[PDB]
Amino acid sequence: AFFSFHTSVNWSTSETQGKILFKQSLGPLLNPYLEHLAKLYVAWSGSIDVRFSISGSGVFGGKLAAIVVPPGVDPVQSTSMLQYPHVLFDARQVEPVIFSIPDLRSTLYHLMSDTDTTSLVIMVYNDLINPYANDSNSSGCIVTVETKPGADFKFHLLKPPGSMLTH
Amino acid sequence: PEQGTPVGGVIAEPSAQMSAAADMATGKSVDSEWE
Amino acid sequence: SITAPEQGTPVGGVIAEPSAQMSAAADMATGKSVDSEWEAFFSFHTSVNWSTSETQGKILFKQSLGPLLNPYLEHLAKLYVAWSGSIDVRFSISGSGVFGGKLAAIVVPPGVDPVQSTSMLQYPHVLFDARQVEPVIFSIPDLRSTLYHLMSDTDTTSLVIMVYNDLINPYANDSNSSGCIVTVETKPGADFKFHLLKPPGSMLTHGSVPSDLIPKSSSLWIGNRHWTDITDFVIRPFVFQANRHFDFNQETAGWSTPRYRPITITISEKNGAKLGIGVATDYIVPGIPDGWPDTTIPEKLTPAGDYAITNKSGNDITTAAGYDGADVIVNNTNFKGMYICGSLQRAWGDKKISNTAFITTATKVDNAIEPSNVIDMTKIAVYQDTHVGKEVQTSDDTLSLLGYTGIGEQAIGSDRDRVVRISVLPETGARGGNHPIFYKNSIKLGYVIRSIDVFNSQILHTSRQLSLNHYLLPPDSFAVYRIIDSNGSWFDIGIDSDGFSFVGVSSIGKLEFPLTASYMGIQLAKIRLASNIR
Amino acid sequence: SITAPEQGTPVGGVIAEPSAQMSAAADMATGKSVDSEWEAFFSFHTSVNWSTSETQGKILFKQSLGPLLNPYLEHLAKLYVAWSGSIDVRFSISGSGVFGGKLAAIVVPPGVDPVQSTSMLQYPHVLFDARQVEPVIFSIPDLRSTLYHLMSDTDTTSLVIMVYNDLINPYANDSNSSGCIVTVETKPGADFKFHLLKPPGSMLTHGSVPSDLIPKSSSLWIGNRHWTDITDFVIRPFVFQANRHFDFNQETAGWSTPRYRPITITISEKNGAKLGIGVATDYIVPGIPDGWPDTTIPEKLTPAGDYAITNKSGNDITTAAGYDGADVIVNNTNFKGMYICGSLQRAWGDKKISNTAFITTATKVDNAIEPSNVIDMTKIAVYQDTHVGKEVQTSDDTLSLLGYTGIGEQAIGSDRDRVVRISVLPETGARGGNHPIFYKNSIKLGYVIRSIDVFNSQILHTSRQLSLNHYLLPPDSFAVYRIIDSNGSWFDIGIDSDGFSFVGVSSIGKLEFPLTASYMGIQLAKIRLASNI
Amino acid sequence: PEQGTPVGGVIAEPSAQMSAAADMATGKSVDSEWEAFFSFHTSVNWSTSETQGKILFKQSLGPLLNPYLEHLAKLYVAWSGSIDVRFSISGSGVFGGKLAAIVVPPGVDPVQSTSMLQYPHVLFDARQVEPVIFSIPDLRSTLYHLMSDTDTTSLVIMVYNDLINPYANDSNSSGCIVTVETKPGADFKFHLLKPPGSMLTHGSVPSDLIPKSSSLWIGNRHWTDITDFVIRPFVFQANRHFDFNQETAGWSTPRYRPITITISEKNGAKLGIGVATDYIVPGIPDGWPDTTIPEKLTPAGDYAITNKSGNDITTAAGYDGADVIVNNTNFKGMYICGSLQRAWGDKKISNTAFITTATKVDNAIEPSNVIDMTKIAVYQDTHVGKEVQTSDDTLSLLGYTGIGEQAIGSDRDRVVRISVLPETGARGGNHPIFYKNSIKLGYVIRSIDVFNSQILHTSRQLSLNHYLLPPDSFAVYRIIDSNGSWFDIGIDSDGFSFVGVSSIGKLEFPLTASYMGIQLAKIRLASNIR
Numbered sequence A: 001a002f003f004s005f006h007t008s009v010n011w012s013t014s015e016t017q018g019k020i021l022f023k024q025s026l027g028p029l030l031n032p033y034l035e036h037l038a039k040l041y042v043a044w045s046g047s048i049d050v051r052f053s054i055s056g057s058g059v060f061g062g063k064l065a066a067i068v069v070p071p072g073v074d075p076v077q078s079t080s081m082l083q084y085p086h087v088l089f090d091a092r093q094v095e096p097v098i099f100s101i102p103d104l105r106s107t108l109y110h111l112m113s114d115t116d117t118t119s120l121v122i123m124v125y126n127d128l129i130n131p132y133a134n135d136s137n138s139s140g141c142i143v144t145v146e147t148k149p150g151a152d153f154k155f156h157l158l159k160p161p162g163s164m165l166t167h
Numbered sequence B: 001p002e003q004g005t006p007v008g009g010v011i012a013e014p015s016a017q018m019s020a021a022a023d024m025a026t027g028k029s030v031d032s033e034w035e
Numbered sequence C: 001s002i003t004a005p006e007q008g009t010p011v012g013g014v015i016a017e018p019s020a021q022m023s024a025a026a027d028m029a030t031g032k033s034v035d036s037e038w039e040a041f042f043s044f045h046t047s048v049n050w051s052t053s054e055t056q057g058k059i060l061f062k063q064s065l066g067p068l069l070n071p072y073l074e075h076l077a078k079l080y081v082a083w084s085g086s087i088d089v090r091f092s093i094s095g096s097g098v099f100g101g102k103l104a105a106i107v108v109p110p111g112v113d114p115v116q117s118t119s120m121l122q123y124p125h126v127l128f129d130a131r132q133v134e135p136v137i138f139s140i141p142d143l144r145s146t147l148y149h150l151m152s153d154t155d156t157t158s159l160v161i162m163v164y165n166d167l168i169n170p171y172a173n174d175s176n177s178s179g180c181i182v183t184v185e186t187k188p189g190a191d192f193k194f195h196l197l198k199p200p201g202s203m204l205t206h207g208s209v210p211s212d213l214i215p216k217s218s219s220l221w222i223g224n225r226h227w228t229d230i231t232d233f234v235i236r237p238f239v240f241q242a243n244r245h246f247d248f249n250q251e252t253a254g255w256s257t258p259r260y261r262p263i264t265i266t267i268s269e270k271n272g273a274k275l276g277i278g279v280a281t282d283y284i285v286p287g288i289p290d291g292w293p294d295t296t297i298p299e300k301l302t303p304a305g306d307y308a309i310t311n312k313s314g315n316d317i318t319t320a321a322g323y324d325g326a327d328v329i330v331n332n333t334n335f336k337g338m339y340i341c342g343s344l345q346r347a348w349g350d351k352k353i354s355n356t357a358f359i360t361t362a363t364k365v366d367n368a369i370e371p372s373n374v375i376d377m378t379k380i381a382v383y384q385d386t387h388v389g390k391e392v393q394t395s396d397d398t399l400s401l402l403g404y405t406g407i408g409e410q411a412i413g414s415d416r417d418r419v420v421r422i423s424v425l426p427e428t429g430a431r432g433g434n435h436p437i438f439y440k441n442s443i444k445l446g447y448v449i450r451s452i453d454v455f456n457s458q459i460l461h462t463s464r465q466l467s468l469n470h471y472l473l474p475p476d477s478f479a480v481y482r483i484i485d486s487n488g489s490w491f492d493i494g495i496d497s498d499g500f501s502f503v504g505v506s507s508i509g510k511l512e513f514p515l516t517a518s519y520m521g522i523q524l525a526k527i528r529l530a531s532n533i534r
Numbered sequence D: 001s002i003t004a005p006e007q008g009t010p011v012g013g014v015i016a017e018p019s020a021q022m023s024a025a026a027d028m029a030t031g032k033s034v035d036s037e038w039e040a041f042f043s044f045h046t047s048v049n050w051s052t053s054e055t056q057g058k059i060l061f062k063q064s065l066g067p068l069l070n071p072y073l074e075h076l077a078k079l080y081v082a083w084s085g086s087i088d089v090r091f092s093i094s095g096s097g098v099f100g101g102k103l104a105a106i107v108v109p110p111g112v113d114p115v116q117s118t119s120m121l122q123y124p125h126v127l128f129d130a131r132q133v134e135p136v137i138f139s140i141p142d143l144r145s146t147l148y149h150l151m152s153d154t155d156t157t158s159l160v161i162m163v164y165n166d167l168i169n170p171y172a173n174d175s176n177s178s179g180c181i182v183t184v185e186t187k188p189g190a191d192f193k194f195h196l197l198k199p200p201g202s203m204l205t206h207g208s209v210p211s212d213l214i215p216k217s218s219s220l221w222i223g224n225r226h227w228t229d230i231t232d233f234v235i236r237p238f239v240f241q242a243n244r245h246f247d248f249n250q251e252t253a254g255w256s257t258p259r260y261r262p263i264t265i266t267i268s269e270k271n272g273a274k275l276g277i278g279v280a281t282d283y284i285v286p287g288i289p290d291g292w293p294d295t296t297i298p299e300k301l302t303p304a305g306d307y308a309i310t311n312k313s314g315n316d317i318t319t320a321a322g323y324d325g326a327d328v329i330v331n332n333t334n335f336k337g338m339y340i341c342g343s344l345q346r347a348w349g350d351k352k353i354s355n356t357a358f359i360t361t362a363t364k365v366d367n368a369i370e371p372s373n374v375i376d377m378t379k380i381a382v383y384q385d386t387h388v389g390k391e392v393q394t395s396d397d398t399l400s401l402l403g404y405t406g407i408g409e410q411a412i413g414s415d416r417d418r419v420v421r422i423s424v425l426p427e428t429g430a431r432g433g434n435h436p437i438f439y440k441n442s443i444k445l446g447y448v449i450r451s452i453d454v455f456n457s458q459i460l461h462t463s464r465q466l467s468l469n470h471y472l473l474p475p476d477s478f479a480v481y482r483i484i485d486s487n488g489s490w491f492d493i494g495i496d497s498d499g500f501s502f503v504g505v506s507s508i509g510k511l512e513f514p515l516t517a518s519y520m521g522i523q524l525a526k527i528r529l530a531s532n533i
Numbered sequence E: 001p002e003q004g005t006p007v008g009g010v011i012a013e014p015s016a017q018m019s020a021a022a023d024m025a026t027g028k029s030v031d032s033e034w035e036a037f038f039s040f041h042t043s044v045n046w047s048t049s050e051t052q053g054k055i056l057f058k059q060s061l062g063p064l065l066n067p068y069l070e071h072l073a074k075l076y077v078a079w080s081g082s083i084d085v086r087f088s089i090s091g092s093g094v095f096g097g098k099l100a101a102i103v104v105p106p107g108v109d110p111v112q113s114t115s116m117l118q119y120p121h122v123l124f125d126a127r128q129v130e131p132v133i134f135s136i137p138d139l140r141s142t143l144y145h146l147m148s149d150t151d152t153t154s155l156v157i158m159v160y161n162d163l164i165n166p167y168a169n170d171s172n173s174s175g176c177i178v179t180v181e182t183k184p185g186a187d188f189k190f191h192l193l194k195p196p197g198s199m200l201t202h203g204s205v206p207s208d209l210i211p212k213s214s215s216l217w218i219g220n221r222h223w224t225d226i227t228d229f230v231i232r233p234f235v236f237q238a239n240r241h242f243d244f245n246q247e248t249a250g251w252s253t254p255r256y257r258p259i260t261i262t263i264s265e266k267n268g269a270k271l272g273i274g275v276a277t278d279y280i281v282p283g284i285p286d287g288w289p290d291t292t293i294p295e296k297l298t299p300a301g302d303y304a305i306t307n308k309s310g311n312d313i314t315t316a317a318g319y320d321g322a323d324v325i326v327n328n329t330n331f332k333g334m335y336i337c338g339s340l341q342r343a344w345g346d347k348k349i350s351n352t353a354f355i356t357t358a359t360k361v362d363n364a365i366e367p368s369n370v371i372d373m374t375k376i377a378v379y380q381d382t383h384v385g386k387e388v389q390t391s392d393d394t395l396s397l398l399g400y401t402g403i404g405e406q407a408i409g410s411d412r413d414r415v416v417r418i419s420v421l422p423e424t425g426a427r428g429g430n431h432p433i434f435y436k437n438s439i440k441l442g443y444v445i446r447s448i449d450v451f452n453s454q455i456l457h458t459s460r461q462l463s464l465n466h467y468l469l470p471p472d473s474f475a476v477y478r479i480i481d482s483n484g485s486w487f488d489i490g491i492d493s494d495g496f497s498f499v500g501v502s503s504i505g506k507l508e509f510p511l512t513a514s515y516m517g518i519q520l521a522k523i524r525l526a527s528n529i530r
C-alpha cells in the first residue's frame, strides 16, 4: 500500500549526457518486504511500482530520465536509448513521479535467481549545471528510488525451510 | 492520497491473465499457505 | 502433383486381403484387451529399508519427476523430444502390527533440493504408519514454468519419503535393530504425454540426462590410465588427471583418445645410442602420441644396466619371501619409473631381434633423462637399443604398455609433480563435504611377480561417453549413481561437470565387487552423498 | 500458368498447424499497443544550445517536417518512397532557476524562409520560459499543395526555435558560457502514414536526403588527401581540390578512388637514371595510378644528394631540435617538396635491397624535373636508385606513401599552382557571406621528427558517400549540419552541390576535439550559417 | 498519461480528408503491405546429378526468411509465429522428379540422411502447374522468442526421387530452377520494441561475419584479397584472430596501418631492437607480423638464389623452371617494409627495413616463436656512427624475403605467439581451413602464398560485437560461385572456420557468402563443389 525506500544514487556535474547512474532488474530485492518473504518461496511473478525524486536545488539545472528496458537487452551509455519511452524528471522538479515496471516474461513464473527480467535505468538526459563551483565540481542531487509491489505481484511455490535452491 | 504523479511513459500494460497463468503453473490457491 | 503422408491409391493384397477373424484370433490366443498396457499397472522402481536405527528427519526416498522412473516411458522417450505431465508413485509397507512409527511424504516443488532435516516437515506433509495396510499413490504434479519439458530437463517436482517418527519394536532391545522395508512403484499417470516425435538420425541439440556414464555392472569398469579392471575405490583430498580425463564440454587437457591401442612412433638415433627421442605418428595433439603414458620418473638417472632392489639395508631381494617380507624398498635400478612396451622395432638393415623399451616424458642430455612433467614434441623418451652404429637409422616402432618398472613406489597418480600435463592439470578438492575418489587398478611390474596400484580419475566408459555425447550439468551439481554391493551395503557416487567423481563418506571399506550402479538423479554438490556402509 | 503475389497451393505445416491461442498467449506475455509502438510516445531527436550571446530574434533551430524528425520513421522510410501527415513535438529546456530569458517555437508554413527578427513573433508561437519545468506539446501539420510527398521533399511545413527574450545570468560576466540545453522530441501524428513501397535496391529518381555525409563523431573524420585524422578547421577565401573530391553527381575532376592504398607502377630506365617515369597498373583514368599525390614541386630541381636545412639567412643548420624557434627555412635540398614513399623495387638481376622513392608529378626534361601544374601519363616522376646499368631495367615498384619533403613550407593545399588537376580545378569562394573551409590534418616530414599541415576539401566519408549514393540538393542550397564540441561552442557547416563545406564565421578558434555532427536541414546558400564561438 | 501540456499556438488544423486523398492517389489499402505477398528469398538449381537424400533448402523459422521482417527485426528483440514459404520449380514437362518437404521440430538438428523421410513428409512433383505453400508453425515451449533464438521449427526439402531428363547427354547439364519466396503468416508478430543502440545481454546473431562479396574479403595476416581456400588438419593463429568473446591471444588490432617504433643503436649497427610507441599489449608495436625466421642469420649482404645445383636465378625462366629453390641470402624469412626513418642530424635518405621476431647477439638474430619487447628485431642502416641515435622509424609492410619457403602460417614453429596458440583440428567430419592470400617478394617479381585463419571483417566484427554461439555449434555460411558450385563454411566459437568437403578445387572467384543459420558441429557441412 505504500512506497518504501530502497536506494539512493548521486548525480554530479561530472556525469555527462547519456551516462547511466542506475541499473537494477525487476525482482523482490527492489523492496525490503519482498526480500523478507522471498525467503519463504522459490518463485515469483508480477510488477513493481516505483517512485523516484531528486533532492535538488533551485540553482541546479540538468535533467534526468528513467527507462524501463525490456528483458534481454543490456543498455548503452548513449542518448539513443532516449528514443524509447522514458520518464523525464528535471532537477528543479519537486513532486515525485510514479510508474510501473511490468513483468514481461517468456515463462509463467520466475525464480529468485532470475536476473533476465525487465529492468530500470536512470540515464542522464541533460548534464547537471551549477554556475558556482567551477573549482571543486562536487555538486549533489541525491536521487532516491522507492518501490511498492504491484497488484499483479505474488509469490509462488513455498520452499521447505532449510532446503536449498538448485539455481 | 499518496504523493507522486503517475505517468505512463511505458509500453508496459501489465496483463492480469499472466498472473492467472502463474496460478495455473503453480497450484497457488491461497495467499498465506502456512495457515 | 502433391501427395500427403497417408495418400496413394490402394490395391491391397492381390491373392488375399487382411482379415479381422485372424486378428481377433490373436486377441483370443493372447490377453490383448487394450494397447499401452504400462498405463494400466504400477511397475517396480525401488525399495528402501526403514530400520529403528534411523532417526527422524532422515530421507529414505528421493526422486524427481520424469520418464526415467518407469522403464516403459524411458523406452518411448527415445522417439520424442519433449514430455509433460504427472507420474503416480505407489508405496507399499507391511508392518508387524505391534510396530509403531509414522513415515512422512513431501512433494517438494521444482527449484529446490531437499535436506535431511525436520525443517522439511515445516511444510505440507502426508503421514502413514507402519500399520498401513493398503498402498498409497502420491501423484507427482508437473509444475513447470515452460509449456512442455524436454528430456534433458531435470528441475522438476520431486517427492521424498522421510522419517517422521522412529520405528518402534516393543520387544526389541536397545542393542538389536529391526526394520520394515518400503517398496516403491510407478505408473505413467493420466496427464502424462510425450510430445514432438523426432525423426531418426537426429541430434537432439541438448542431449539427454547423464544416465549412461557408469555401467550397471563392475565387469565393464576399466580405468582411464591403465586398461585393467577396477577393484576398489580410494578417497583422497585431491584428485587429478589429464590424459584420458574428459569433462562435460567434450574437451580435455590431455593428448589421447578414450581407447587403448599400441603406440606407433619413429626414432632416429644417430650414433651408439641406447636412448633417443621419438616423434608422433598417430596423434590428436601435434607432437604427442596417442596413448602415451602420463607419468614421469622420480629422479635424473642414466638407463644403462639391470634391475636392483634392496630391503632397506642393502639386502638384495630375489624371492617372494623377501619382497613381501620387506617393509620398504630402495630400488637402486637405473631405469626406475618407466614402461616396458614390447617394441617390435623394425628398420631397414636391422636383422637383429627387437628389444623392449622404457618410456616416459623427460628431457635428454647426451646420456641421461631428467624428470620433466610437461609433455611436448621433445619429451618423448625411449630406451630400447635399436642396434645403431655411427649412422642414422630411423627405425619405426610400435609399443604396447605392459608393466611399470617403478618397484616399491607408491600408487601411480599419487604425486602431481610426477603426473604429466600439457599446460593445465584438472584437479578438485572436497566439494560440499563430499570427498573425491580415484578408481583403483593394478599394473604389472618388471621382474617381480607382484603388481602395483594405479589410480584413475574416471572409468573409461565415463570418458568415452563424455567425448561423444553432449550432456547438461551446471558446475554446482552432480550426476548421482547409487552403488550397491552383494550384501546390500550401498553408497552414492556423484560425477562432476569437471568429470571427477566424489563420495559422501571418509572411508568406504571393503565390499563384494560383483556390484552394480544405478542412476538416481541430479543432485546439488553441497548435499552429502548418501551412504549405508556395513 | 499465371500466379499472383498471394497465390499458390496451401499445404500447411505437415506436423502441426498454426495456433491462435499461442499468438494470443504471446500478446499478454509482452503487453501490446496496436502494431506500431512508436506512434505512442515522444522520442529524442536532437538538442540545441542557448547561451547568453544569442540576442533577441536569433534562430537556434530550423528543421522541416519529414520522417527524419523521428528515428523510427527514418527506419521505415527506407521501405517507401512517399509519405504524408503530421509530427507531434515536445520540447523543453534544462535550465536553472537563476536563468531568465524566454524562447519561442514557430511552425512556419511551406515556402517561407524565416528571418532573424522579432517580426516572426507576430504569428502564432509557443512561448517557453527557461524557468519552466513541464514540457509543452504541439503539432506540425502537413500543409501540402500535393497529395503525397517524396522523401527528398524539403519544402514542407517547418519548425523554428527563436529567441524571444535574451538569456540572462548575473553571475558570469567574465566567461559568458551559460547553458540551457534545449531538447526536441518527436512522435508521429495519427494522420501520418507512408505510401508507395519501393522495391528493395531500387533507386529514387528525386534522390535521397543528404543526412549521412559527415559522421557523428570526429574519431571517424579523415582527409581526402592524407589518411590522418582531422584535428581542426581552416577558413580561406578560396578552397580547391580535385583528386578525391566528389560532387553530388558522383563526379570527380581527379583520378583516384576514395581510398588510400599502395601505388603500383612500372619504371623503365637505362644508362644510370635514378629519375624515371612510371606507368600505371591500377587506375580509374588511363595513365595515372589510383592514389597518386595531387601536388607538384615548387620549382625546377635536380635530385642528387641529401637533406639540407638552414634558418633565416644565417647558414645555420637545424641539426638539433633548434629547428623550432627559427620561423623561416631555406630548404636547400635538391629534392624540395616530393612525397616520400616506401618502395619494393622488384627486378631481375638487381640483387640489392630496395630504396625510398621520392615521387611527384613533373616533366622529365633531363635528370632535372620541371613543375607540371597538370598531370598526365608523361608526368609521373619517381626519383630512386633502382640500380640501373647500361641495359634497360623494368622493375616493379609498389609504393606506399609515408611522408613529405617540403620542410618549412605552408600547408599542402595553400598554393594553387602547385596543386594538381587534370584540366579543370574545382574551386569555390564565398557564397553569400559564408566562407569556405579546408579540413586540416598532418603529414610527417622526412628529416625532422616534426610534421607539416595538410589541407583537405572533404572528409573521406563525405567522398565515399558522394561516390556511391545519390542525393538531391539544388545548386542554390546547402546540406547544413551542426558541429558541437565538448564545450557549448557550435557552428553550422554547409556542404554544397560541388562538394565543398562552408562556414558562417571568419574564425572558428580552438575547440575541445571530441566533436559531433547532426543533420539540421537544407538551407539556402545566401543566409549566413549559425554559430556560437 | 504522458508528460507535457498541449498548446494550440497554431493555425494548423490537420485535416483527416487529406490522408484519404493520399490513400486515393496511392492504393494504400494496408498498413503493412509485406504481409500480403510472397517475397523472393533464394534460388537453387536442382540438377539431374543430385541424388536422393540431398537437401536443397533448409532454414529455421525466423525473421531472416523475409527482408521486410529482417528490417523490422532491428527495432525489436522478440517475435512469434509462422512464416509461409512458396516454391516454383520451373522445368520442362519431359522432366520427371520429386521432392519431399520435412518440417522438423524445435529441438533437433536434421541431417542429409534418408532417416528424415521416416517422418511425416509431403511430396511434390517437378511438373506442377501451381506453386505450393508451406507454413512453418512456431512450436515452442516459451511464450515468445528472442532474435538470438535458433532452436526453432525448421523446414527441410530434399530429393525424394532424382530428377530425370530423357534428352540428357554429357553436354546437357539442364534441370529445374527452384525459387523460394516467403510471406509472414497471419500469426506472425513482433514483440518487445527495444531501445536503439542496445545490445542483447546474451548475444546477437552471427549474420554478418563473412561479407556477401569476395570483392572485399581480406586476410587477418596480410592485407591482400583472398583468392581461394585451403584445407589442412590443424589451423592456428594468434595475431588478429578473435574468438566469440572479444578476446585475443595476439597483440594487434583488426586492421592494417603503419608500425611506428624507435630504435636506439650505435657503432654502425645495422641491427637493432625496437620499442613500441603504439601498442594495445604492452611492449609490442600493434601490427608486428606473426612469423619468425627459419634459422639463425647474420644479415649482412644481398639476395642470393640457386636451384639445388649452384646455378643462379636472374630471369623468369629458372624460378618457374626450377626443381626447388635455395635461398642463400643472409636475410631470408623476414618482412620487407618501407621504413621512413627520421633522426635529428641524419642528412641521409631512409633505407628500407627487414623486420622479424627474433633475439639478437651483437650481429645476428635467432628465431623465437615467443614475442616480447626483446624480440622486435629490425635490419636497417640508419646511418649511425659511434653514438646512440634514436631514429624514429615508421614501417609499412609490403613484401617478404623468404623466397623459397612454402607458405606463411604453414610451420607451427615459425608462427609467433605470446603465450598461447589458438588451434583447432577437425570436429566431426568437418575439416578446418585457412583463407589463402598472397604477398610479394623482394628480389623476384613473383609472389608467395599466405595463410589466414580469418577474413578481416570476421575479426573486427568479433572484436566489437558480442554474438551468441554454443561451443558445440557453428555459424554456417553458404558460399556460391559464379558457376554454381557451392559449399558451407562453419565458424567455431573459437573464431576458426571449418568445411565439410576434403578438397574445394577450382572456383570462379566472384563469390558471395550467405548465412544459413546455426548447425551442430558434429554434422557434416554441405558441399556441391562439382
Ligand SMILES: [K+]
Residues within 6 Å of the ligand: C344, C345, C346, C347, C350, C351, C352, C353, C354
Ligand atoms: K629389428
Ligand SMILES: [K+]
Residues within 6 Å of the ligand: D345, D346, D347, D350, D351, D352, D353, D354, E442, E443
Ligand atoms: K631489388
Ligand SMILES: [K+]
Residues within 6 Å of the ligand: D446, D447, E341, E342, E343, E346, E347, E348, E349, E350
Ligand atoms: K633519414
